[PDB]
Design an enzyme around this catalytic site. Structure first.
Site, PDB file in Angstrom:
ATOM      1  N   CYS A 137       0.857  -1.198   0.000  1.00 15.69           N
ATOM      2  CA  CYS A 137       0.000   0.000   0.000  1.00 15.69           C
ATOM      3  C   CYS A 137       0.897   1.254   0.000  1.00 15.69           C
ATOM      4  O   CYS A 137       2.111   1.133   0.155  1.00 15.69           O
ATOM      5  CB  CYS A 137      -0.968  -0.153   1.191  1.00 15.69           C
ATOM      6  SG  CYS A 137      -2.108   1.250   1.392  1.00 15.69           S
ATOM      7  N   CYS A 190      -2.616   0.607  -3.837  1.00 12.74           N
ATOM      8  CA  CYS A 190      -2.163   2.001  -3.680  1.00 12.74           C
ATOM      9  C   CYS A 190      -3.157   3.090  -4.124  1.00 12.74           C
ATOM     10  O   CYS A 190      -3.019   4.232  -3.684  1.00 12.74           O
ATOM     11  CB  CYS A 190      -0.810   2.148  -4.386  1.00 12.74           C
ATOM     12  SG  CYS A 190       0.383   0.990  -3.653  1.00 12.74           S
TER      13      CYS A 190
END
EC number: 1.20.4.1
Length: 131
Positions: free
Chosen positions: A8, A80
């Site tokens: 992430c 992301c």
């Protein structure tokens, strides 16, 4: 048994829930780790949102991609929200996926629940392929 690793943006959310579902639902099928291309801290509402389903992630916080070993993780996942492509060995896995979900940090607990359900379903669909 194969290994899955989650990326992430600052490892604060998404990735940490993905380890939370996979360590519970994939217990003895898989092994899992959470990271990000940058590091900050775990978002405290993430733990509260995993505790609604009785899953603990409080023993986790943010850790950077640069300390980890993409070569050993049979699968790598990006979470992301675009802006990220992982040019190194972080895309040379047996499987790579990108789960472009909503961003709950500073939103509402219904938006955390909306993200949590999608992170859960992608993990349950993945572990049944790579067990």
């Amino acid at each position: 048994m194969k290994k899955v690793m989650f990326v992430c943006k600052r490892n604060s959310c998404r990735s940490q829930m993905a380890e939370g579902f996979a360590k519970t639902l994939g217990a003895g099928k898989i092994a899992v780790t959470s990271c990000g291309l940058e590091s900050s801290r775990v978002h405290p509402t993430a733990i509260a949102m995993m505790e609604e389903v009785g899953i603990d992630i409080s023993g986790q916080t943010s850790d950077p991609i640069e300390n980890f070993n993409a070569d050993d993780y049979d699968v790598v996942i990006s979470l992301c929200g675009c802006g990220v492509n992982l040019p190194p060995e972080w895309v040379t896995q047996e499987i790579f996926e990108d789960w472009q979900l909503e961003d709950p940090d500073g939103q509402s607990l219904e938006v955390f629940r909306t993200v949590r359900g999608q992170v859960k379903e992608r993990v349950e669909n993945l572990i049944a392929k790579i067990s």
